[PDB]
Design an enzyme around this catalytic site. Structure first.
Site, PDB file in Angstrom:
ATOM      1  N   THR D  57       0.843  -1.194   0.000  1.00  0.00           N
ATOM      2  CA  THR D  57       0.000   0.000   0.000  1.00  0.00           C
ATOM      3  C   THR D  57       0.885   1.252   0.000  1.00  0.00           C
ATOM      4  O   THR D  57       0.510   2.266  -0.606  1.00  0.00           O
ATOM      5  CB  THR D  57      -0.992   0.019   1.176  1.00  0.00           C
ATOM      6  OG1 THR D  57      -0.272   0.148   2.398  1.00  0.00           O
ATOM      7  CG2 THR D  57      -1.842  -1.271   1.179  1.00  0.00           C
ATOM      8  N   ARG D 176     -43.697  25.853   4.570  1.00  0.00           N
ATOM      9  CA  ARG D 176     -42.695  25.397   5.538  1.00  0.00           C
ATOM     10  C   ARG D 176     -41.307  25.765   5.056  1.00  0.00           C
ATOM     11  O   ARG D 176     -41.102  26.134   3.910  1.00  0.00           O
ATOM     12  CB  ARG D 176     -42.785  23.885   5.743  1.00  0.00           C
ATOM     13  CG  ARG D 176     -42.401  23.089   4.504  1.00  0.00           C
ATOM     14  CD  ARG D 176     -42.489  21.594   4.727  1.00  0.00           C
ATOM     15  NE  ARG D 176     -41.963  20.891   3.546  1.00  0.00           N
ATOM     16  CZ  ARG D 176     -41.733  19.581   3.468  1.00  0.00           C
ATOM     17  NH1 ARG D 176     -41.992  18.785   4.493  1.00  0.00           N
ATOM     18  NH2 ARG D 176     -41.256  19.058   2.333  1.00  0.00           N
ATOM     19  N   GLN D 228     -39.349  14.744  -2.749  1.00  0.00           N
ATOM     20  CA  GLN D 228     -39.457  13.776  -3.852  1.00  0.00           C
ATOM     21  C   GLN D 228     -39.707  14.491  -5.187  1.00  0.00           C
ATOM     22  O   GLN D 228     -38.998  14.255  -6.185  1.00  0.00           O
ATOM     23  CB  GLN D 228     -40.600  12.801  -3.560  1.00  0.00           C
ATOM     24  CG  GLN D 228     -40.291  11.760  -2.463  1.00  0.00           C
ATOM     25  CD  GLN D 228     -40.631  12.213  -1.053  1.00  0.00           C
ATOM     26  OE1 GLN D 228     -40.649  13.409  -0.739  1.00  0.00           O
ATOM     27  NE2 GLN D 228     -40.884  11.233  -0.187  1.00  0.00           N
ATOM     28  N   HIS D 256     -35.042  19.281   9.480  1.00  0.00           N
ATOM     29  CA  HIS D 256     -36.277  19.903   9.968  1.00  0.00           C
ATOM     30  C   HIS D 256     -36.059  21.129  10.828  1.00  0.00           C
ATOM     31  O   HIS D 256     -35.167  21.164  11.665  1.00  0.00           O
ATOM     32  CB  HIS D 256     -37.107  18.879  10.740  1.00  0.00           C
ATOM     33  CG  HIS D 256     -37.354  17.611   9.979  1.00  0.00           C
ATOM     34  ND1 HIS D 256     -38.138  17.565   8.846  1.00  0.00           N
ATOM     35  CD2 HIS D 256     -36.891  16.353  10.169  1.00  0.00           C
ATOM     36  CE1 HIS D 256     -38.171  16.323   8.389  1.00  0.00           C
ATOM     37  NE2 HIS D 256     -37.412  15.571   9.166  1.00  0.00           N
TER      38      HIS D 256
END
Ligand SMILES: O=c1[nH]c(=O)c2nn[nH]c2[nH]1
Ligand SMILES: O=c1[nH]c(=O)c2nn[nH]c2[nH]1
Ligand SMILES: O=c1[nH]c(=O)c2nn[nH]c2[nH]1
Ligand SMILES: O=c1[nH]c(=O)c2nn[nH]c2[nH]1
Ligand code: NA
Ligand code: NA
Ligand code: NA
Ligand code: NA
Lengths: 295, 295, 295, 295
Positions: D57, D176, D228, D256
C-alpha cells in the site's frame, strides 16, 4: 426519464428503552440509533406530486417508538425484523423495508466489586450493528456487525516478501506495530419470515460474542505475516463456529506508527531494535478488505 | 500599537512510547497528544520580523520526541514538568512554557483470563490530561484532569423545588434519567521546581485513581437532588483525600432524555411510572460548573 | 470546603429567525447557536440541595426563544447584550450573565444574476461570534470574533533567520506555502449598559467587515517573513480603524504542506524550484498567538 | 472456506498540486484526498501468507504522488482514469482498480475587485468527487458527484396530501422551511479506455457546472410539493442536458426546522402565519433518495 430506484424514510432516530425488574430492582438500559427506508409503489410521489402514496417520514419515526414500546429491542436482529415486517404487512404498496440499527454501549457499573442496579458507563465507542432487509416474497436478510473496535499490538507483526519495483521504497520488516479499527460483518442465511427469525433468537447474541472473541484472540496470538493473513484466520474461525452464517467480511485500516530517526541528535539510537518512541500517523492509511465464504 | 501578550509553539504532536521488559517479555505502551507553547522575550518576531528570537516550532516538535526518548513519560505530570523546564533552562529569553498532554487509553487485553504481554485495546475515549505551566521564578503549576467519562443512571435522580415564573414550563420530577460526560480537574499546590515534582511522583497516579473512583461511586449512589448537589459531593470528597490539591473543578453537561407521550396511539401509556421508551436529545443541553476549594 | 466559583445554564441552543418584508416579499434568515451561563447567589443549590435559587436551564432555553421573538437578533453584539441584561434585571440574586453566540452563514442565492427573495446557501463554515459578559454594576464587556476562515497562499511566504541549535533540523526557506484557519477577536471598550450598546449599533457590523477585509488583504499582499510578522500587521490595522476596540487577538495554526522528494524514482525533480506536488500534513501544526493593544 | 472477494489499497492520501504560469505569474492550486483499492489474483496473500502478490500500500501511495507529478490532476475524471489504468497495465495479476477522489475547494481571492495571483480561500466544505472503476477487459466506469452543498429556503415549500392512519401525527402544511445537504451523482456511459475518456475531457467540468446550476435554480424556483417531487425535476433536467449520462442519483436529507409555540407566555403568537422563531432539529432527519434513468 423514468424512476429506476427510489427509497425514503427516517434516519438518525435515537431511541432509549429501560427494562425494570420489579422483583430484584435491577434496571437494564438499551440505546440505539435507527434508520428505516422504504421501497414500493411510490414512483408517483416523484413524478406526479402524488403524496397519497407517502407514509410520512414523521410517521415512520412514530412507528419506531411504538414498536420499541410493544416489543423487545434485543437482540437487535429480532427488533429490526419486527420493525421491517411491520411496514410490508401494514401498507399494501410498500414492498421492502431496510432497517439499520446501531447499538451503543451502556455497561453496568461495578461499585465496590458489585454490579450496580441502575448505573451505567459508556465503555468505548465500539458498536454492535444490524442491517435488516425485509423484502416481500423474498424473506428477511440480516447482516450483523461489530465496528469501532480499536486495537494495537506492539510486536509480533511482520511484513516482508512483498513485490518490489521502481515504485517501492518500503523496507521489509520482521517486527512492527500493528493497529486497526475492526469492522466485521457476518451475513446470515436468508430467513423465510419472522417465525424463523424468532426460532434462532439465541444464536444472535452468541454469534456476536463469538465473533468478538475470535477477533481479539486471533489478533493477540497470531504472529502476523500481514493484515491479509491475520484477517483471513479470523473469518475462517467464525464460519467454522456458526453454520447459519454464509459469509464474513472484514474491513481493516492499517493505522501506521512510524519510527523516528533521532541519530542526527547526539547519535541517539531510536530505530530497529532500539526503537522506543514512534510517531502515530493520522493519514494516509492502508485499507484491507476481504469477504470469506464457504467452499 | 504594542504586543500585550504572545505565545507560540507546536500543537497536536502525537507520540507513542513502548517499554519492553527483557526479563518478563511484557511490553507496555503509552500514547499521548502533546502541545507546547512558549512565552518570553519574543515581541520583535512580531513587530520587526526578527526571527532570531524564534525557537522554530519544528524544533519544539523534535524536542518533544527527544525528551520522550530520554525520560519516563509517566505519570504525565512528571513528563510535562520535565518538558516545560527544559525550555526555560535551555533558552535564556524564554520565560514560560505551557505544556498540555492528553493521554489515550491502551488497556492490556485479557485473553482466556490472562493479561496479554503485548496486545492492547482502546476501552473508551476517556482521557487523562495534564496542563503544566512552568514559569521562570514562579515554579510549576499543574492541573490534572479526566475527561470524556460518559455515564448514565436510569433512576435515583430528582429535580423539584426550582424557581417558577412566567418563563417556566418545566415540570417538577421525583424520578428522571441523569446522564453526563464528566470533565473533572484538580489543581495542585504550586511546586518550586522539578525536584519537588519528583518528590510527589507517587501521588499523581493515586490521585487520578481516587478522583475517578469518587466520581463513579458518588454518581451511582447519590439520590441526586440536582447535578449541582451531586457534583459538590464529589469535589468535597476529593479535597478530603488529597491535601496537596487546592481546588477541584467539575464541568458537567446535563444530557437530556425526554419522555415520549404515546397516548394518542390507542391510549398507549408511556409517561411517568409507565415510561419505558425515551428520546435522547442531542441538543440543547444543560451545562453546570463549579470550583470547590478549601475553607 | 467552599464554593469558590459557580456558573450554570444552557448550551447548544439552536435558533433560527426569519424576517419577512411585506412590501418587497424579500425574506432574510438568521441562524445561531446560543449558550447562556449565569452566576450569582446560587451556592446553596450546590451545598444544601436548595433548588429555590435555580432558574431552571429549561427556563433559560425558553427565555432565549422569547427574547429572539421580541427583539432584533442582529447585530449579535446587541442581541447578546439584551439577553444578558434580561437575567440580571429579572432575577435579584443573579449578578452576571455570560452569553456566547455563534452565527452561521446563510447567504442569499444569486439565480441568473439576481438575488433570490427566499433561498440561501451555506457558503463555508466561517462563523461570526460574540461573547458578552453582563456583570451587575460593572457594565457590558463584549468580545467579537470571526473564526473558521481558511486560507492558503502558494508563494510569497518565507521563513529564515530563526534560532539554530542541536535541536534544529528545519531548513531555511525563501518560498513556501502558507495556510491557516483564522481566529480573530476584537475586544470592545467596556459599555455602561444597554443604552450605550444601542448607541454604537452601526459600528458592530462595520468593524466585523473591516476585520475580515484587513485579514484577507494583508494575508494576500504581505510578503510574509513569518506568521508572527504578518499577524501583527493585521492587528495593527484593525486597531487603527476602530478607536472603540481596546485589543485584537489572533490565534493562527500553521497548516504545513511538505515537499515530496521523488528523486529516488527515475531522478524525478520535485523539490525547491521544481516543487509541484506536496503532501498536506494533518498534524502536528504550529500554533501562533498574539494580543495587540494600544501604546 | 474460500475468498469470495478481496480488495486492498491506500485510503486518505492527501495531495496538493500547484500550477505556475511563467508568463502571467498566476498560480493555481488543486487539493484532493485520494483512495485507491486494487483487486486481482491476490487470494494467496490471505490464504497462504504469500506476500509476493502484494503491491505494498506504501507503493500505491508513492504511485499517486508520481502520477500527479507527471499528469494533469484536472478534471478529476481524467486523473482518476489515468491512475486506475496505470495499475492494470503495470501489474499482470491486478485486474481492477477502484479510485475515489474528493476535491477540496480553493477559490481564488478577489482583493479590491481583482483576482489575486496566488491567494485562495476555502469557500465551503462542498466537494466535487469522482469514483472511477477501471476493470480489465470491461473499460472505465465513472461516477461523478457533488456533495456537501447545504441550502435553505424559508418559504415556497409545501407538504400535504400524504397518507394518514393511526400512526400519523404530522399536520399538513402549505408553507414550511425546506433545508437539505445535496448529494448528487451522475453516472457516465461506460468508456472503452483512456483514449475515449480523453476524447470527452471538456464534458466533465461542463457537466459538473450544469448539475450544480440545475440543482440550485430548481431548488430556488420550485414551489415544492415534496422533496421527492423537487428532486425528480432536478434529475430530469440534468439527463436532458447531457446525453452521455446514463443515470442521476440524488440523496437528500430533510433537515427539519420546528415551529415553537410560545402562546403559554403572555399569549405570544409564533405559529402558522405568525411564525418567526424556529428550532432547528439536529436529529432525526428525513432521508429521500431516487435514481432517475432514461425511458
Ligand atoms: O418532503 C417531504 N417528504 C416526505 O416524504 C416527508 N415525510 N414527512 N415530511 C416530509 N416531507
Ligand atoms: O511562520 C513560522 N513561524 C514559526 O514560529 C515557525 N516555526 N517553524 N516554522 C515556522 N513558521
Ligand atoms: O440538575 C439540574 N440542574 C439544573 O440546574 C436544571 N435546570 N433544568 N433541569 C435541571 N437539572
Ligand atoms: O499488512 C500489510 N499489508 C499490506 O498490504 C501492506 N502494504 N504496505 N504495508 C502493508 N502491511
Ligand atoms: Na406490502
Ligand atoms: Na529562561
Ligand atoms: Na440582579
Ligand atoms: Na493486468
Amino acid at each position: 426519464s423514468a424512476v429506476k430506484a427510489a427509497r425514503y424514510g427516517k434516519d438518525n432516530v435515537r431511541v432509549y428503552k429501560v427494562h425494570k425488574d420489579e422483583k430484584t430492582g435491577v434496571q437494564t438500559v438499551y440505546e440505539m440509533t435507527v434508520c428505516v427506508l422504504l421501497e414500493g409503489e411510490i414512483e408517483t410521489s416523484y413524478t406526479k406530486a402524488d403524496n397519497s402514496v407517502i407514509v410520512a417520514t414523521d410517521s415512520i419515526k412514530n412507528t419506531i417508538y411504538i414498536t420499541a414500546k410493544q416489543n423487545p429491542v434485543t437482540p437487535p436482529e429480532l427488533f429490526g425484523s419486527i420493525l421491517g415486517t411491520h411496514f410490508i404487512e401494514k401498507y399494501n404498496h410498500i414492498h421492502a423495508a431496510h432497517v439499520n440499527i446501531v447499538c451503543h454501549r451502556w455497561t453496568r457499573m461495578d461499585i465496590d466489586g458489585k454490579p450496580h442496579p441502575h448505573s451505567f458507563i459508556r465503555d468505548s465507542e465500539e458498536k454492535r450493528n444490524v442491517q435488516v432487509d425485509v423484502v416481500e416474497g423474498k424473506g428477511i436478510d440480516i447482516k450483523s456487525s461489530l465496528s469501532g473496535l480499536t486495537v494495537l499490538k506492539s510486536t509480533n507483526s511482520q511484513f516482508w516478501g512483498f513485490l518490489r519495483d521502481e515504485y517501492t521504497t518500503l523496507k521489509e520488516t520482521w517486527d512492527r506495530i500493528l493497529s486497526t479499527d475492526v469492522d466485521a460483518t457476518w451475513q446470515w442465511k436468508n430467513f423465510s419470515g419472522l417465525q424463523e427469525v424468532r426460532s434462532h433468537v439465541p444464536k444472535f447474541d452468541a454469534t456476536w460474542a463469538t465473533a468478538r472473541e475470535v477477533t481479539l484472540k486471533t489478533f493477540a496470538e497470531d504472529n502476523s505475516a500481514s493484515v491479509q493473513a491475520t484477517m483471513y484466520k479470523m473469518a475462517e474461525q467464525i464460519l467454522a463456529r456458526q453454520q447459519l452464517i454464509e459469509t464474513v467480511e472484514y474491513s481493516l485500516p492499517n493505522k501506521h506508527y512510524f519510527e523516528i530517526d533521532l541519530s542526527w541528535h547526539k547519535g541517539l539510537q531510536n530505530t530497529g531494535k532500539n526503537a522506543e518512541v514512534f510517531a502515530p500517523q493520522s493519514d494516509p492509511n492502508g485499507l484491507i478488505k476481504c469477504t470469506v465464504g464457504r467452499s
